[PDB]
Structure 1
Amino acid sequence: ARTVVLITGCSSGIGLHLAVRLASDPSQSFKVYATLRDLKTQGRLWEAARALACPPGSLETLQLDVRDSKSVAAARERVTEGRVDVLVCNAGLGLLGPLEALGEDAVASVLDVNVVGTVRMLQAFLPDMKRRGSGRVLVTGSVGGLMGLPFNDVYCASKFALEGLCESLAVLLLPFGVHLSLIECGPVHTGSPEEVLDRTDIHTFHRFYQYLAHSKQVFREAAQNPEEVAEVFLTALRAPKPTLRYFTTERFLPLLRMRLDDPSGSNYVTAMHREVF
């Protein structure tokens, strides 16, 4: 009857706002499983759910740790309807800093949550979709998945990885009737200094500050409401033939095109260096 949606990473941000947008939809078309790594963070989702007056039974929370394939399987068994019509792979971690200041565990964690975590969800959920010959997968992407950003080396690695993962899968899934799309987000309004200085050189440290200053100004001028981003997920959801990629904004497309039409990377690296520094 209803469209069953399971969303990862609902404790804040896009995931939180998408979950309550869908559950509160005036048409009541959606049953939403909002999943979270730590149940102690669920308060914010329930406060938003109340604000939007989600009908009882339109929204349920599950604990799901995308690092643990047992946790993934336990949450899938909790989908009482026995299918997922829309899977939204949104859990993700950022990681910001000079590459040599990043702990090895932090690097592996970002990769595990952002890439392997999405692999675990797709392994768990794609089979029943392929069998039914139907289902929609939406994956939260980033501008940092489409072009490299300084001091985001590992975050960008992880978001570029989701691009390759999803594009590869889409080439195969086409004749199966299962549609996968990336939702490419720019900024969204959702170590300490001594720590970082201890792990890098003064010149890199200064470039980091410059990057942070520029980033803050891009964010204050350009950040989108998660309400507006969530509606782009909805657009993808309802598209009779969805495309592989949706963009939540036109903002970064000129930078992207400059990347796109000089494959040597020389124009992009130059332009981004000037843009930031």
Structure 2
Amino acid sequence: ARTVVLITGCSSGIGLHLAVRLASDPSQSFKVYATLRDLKTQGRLWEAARALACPPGSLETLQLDVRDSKSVAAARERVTEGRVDVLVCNAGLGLLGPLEALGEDAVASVLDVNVVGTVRMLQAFLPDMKRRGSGRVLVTGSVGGLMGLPFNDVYCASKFALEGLCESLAVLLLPFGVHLSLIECGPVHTAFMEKVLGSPEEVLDRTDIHTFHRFYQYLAHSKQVFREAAQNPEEVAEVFLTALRAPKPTLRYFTTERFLPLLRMRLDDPSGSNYVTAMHREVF
């Protein structure tokens, strides 16, 4: 039994690099359980693990589908240590395009995986972290949870929710000695954006010409803004570590300092109209 860490969505991006960063730590103090929605996807994980010579006994891959309470509790009973000190809610789905262009199923999944799942992860672990009176939880934050971005309604929705689920919980947990931290990310080189963008071409068939133009117009800005500050998933894991070490973690950590002006100004405007203006005359 050492610092037992249970992380979700370890198949790629931040969930992978993190699992291996923690597991391969030179102070061999982290015993990580990298969970995966689907195990068949644990190749690149193991490959990296080997690439770092991440010592025997530290990383045990486990399967965990966030949109399944059955799948979650079982992956919990499989924690031989019988305790989790750090839980990391990381799984998540993206969604882009004209709101009217998405579908009900699509929308449900995003909120299903990104929010409810975070609830299942919490519901199953927090109890035990509470009677114990010690524990740490980390949730992969996002800009879209602190501000609104065009054609990112449902994702910014799923991420704004997490701000809610966490902050309210953070309150009650104060005397409980359990710790909640939202790692607020920005763009980052992960499997996340490399496919979710789908195919911008089909959109025109479920929207008006004026939005479609604006959808590509956003895409073009997106792609430029990404290849300007998309941080390395390793750089991002670094923040997860600094929170972990903090004796008294804060409600949130920020991986990039670029979105902090938009936020600052945004908070100086309660009606939210100065923000909407800026953000708009920024994307387009």
TM-score (norm 2): 0.96
What SS does the corresponding residue of 2:206 show, helix, strand or coil? Answer: coil
- Distance in 2 (alpha carbons) for counterparts of 1:47 and 1:210: 38
Identity %: 100
* Structure 2 spans left out of the alignment, 5+ residues: 191-197
Partner of 1:97: 97
Q: How far does residue 51 in structure 1 lie from its aligned partner after superposition?
A: 1.1
**Poorly superposed stretches of 4+, deviation over 4 Å:** none
Identify if the C-alpha distance between structure 1 residues 120 and 56 changes in structure 2 by more than 3 Å, giving closer, same or farther.
same
Q: Which digits, 9 at most, give the CA deviation of each residue in 1:81-105, with x for residues without a partner?
A: 1000000000000001100010100
Alignment partner, residue 53 of structure 2: 53
Q: Deviations over 1:211-252 (max 9, x none)?
A: 000000110011111111001000000100000010001100
- CA deviation digits over 1:133-166, x for unaligned, max 9? 0100000010110000000000000000000100
Q: Secondary structure at the match of 1:11?
A: coil
Partner Cα distance (2:269, 2:199) in 1 = 37
1:193 positional shift: 3.5
CA distance in 1, matches of 2:272, 2:235: 32
Quick check: 2:167–2:251 contact (8 Å CA) kept in 1? yes
Contact 2:32 2:60 in 1 (8 A): yes
Q: Secondary structure at the match of 1:34?
A: strand
Contact 2:200/2:216 (<8 A) preserved? no
**23 and 133 in structure 1: CA distance in 2 versus 1, 3 angstrom threshold:** same
**3-state SS, counterpart of residue 6 of structure 1:** strand
CA deviation after TM superposition for structure 1 residue 194, in Å: 3.9
Structure 1: how far apart are the matches of 2:283 and 2:128?
A: 45
Output the CA distance in 2 between the equivalents of 1:204 and 1:257. 29
* 1:220-231 superposed matches below 5 A: 220-231=227-238
SS at match of 1:115: helix
2:226 and 2:245 map into 1 onto residues whose CA distance is 29
Name the structure 2 match of 1:264.
271
Q: What RMSD over aligned residues (CA atoms) do the two structures have, in Å?
A: 0.7
- Report the alpha carbon displacement of residue 192 of structure 1 after superposing the two structures with TM: 2.5
Deviation, structure 1 residue 185: 0.3
CA distance in 2, matches of 1:77, 1:206: 51
Structure 1 residues 80-89 or 185-194, which shifts more? 185-194
Query: Displacement of 1:64 after TM fit?
Result: 0.5
Measured after TM superposition, the shift of residue 38 of structure 1 is: 1.0
How far apart are the structure 2 equivalents of 1:229 and 1:144? 17
Residue aligned with 1:138, SS: strand
TM-score norm. by structure 1 comes to 0.99
Counterpart residue number, 1:159: 159
Rounded to whole Å, the distance in 1 between the matches of 2:136 and 2:90 is: 14
Equivalent-residue separation in structure 1 for 2:5 and 2:102 (angstroms): 35
Partner of 1:36: 36
Shift of 1:189: 1.3
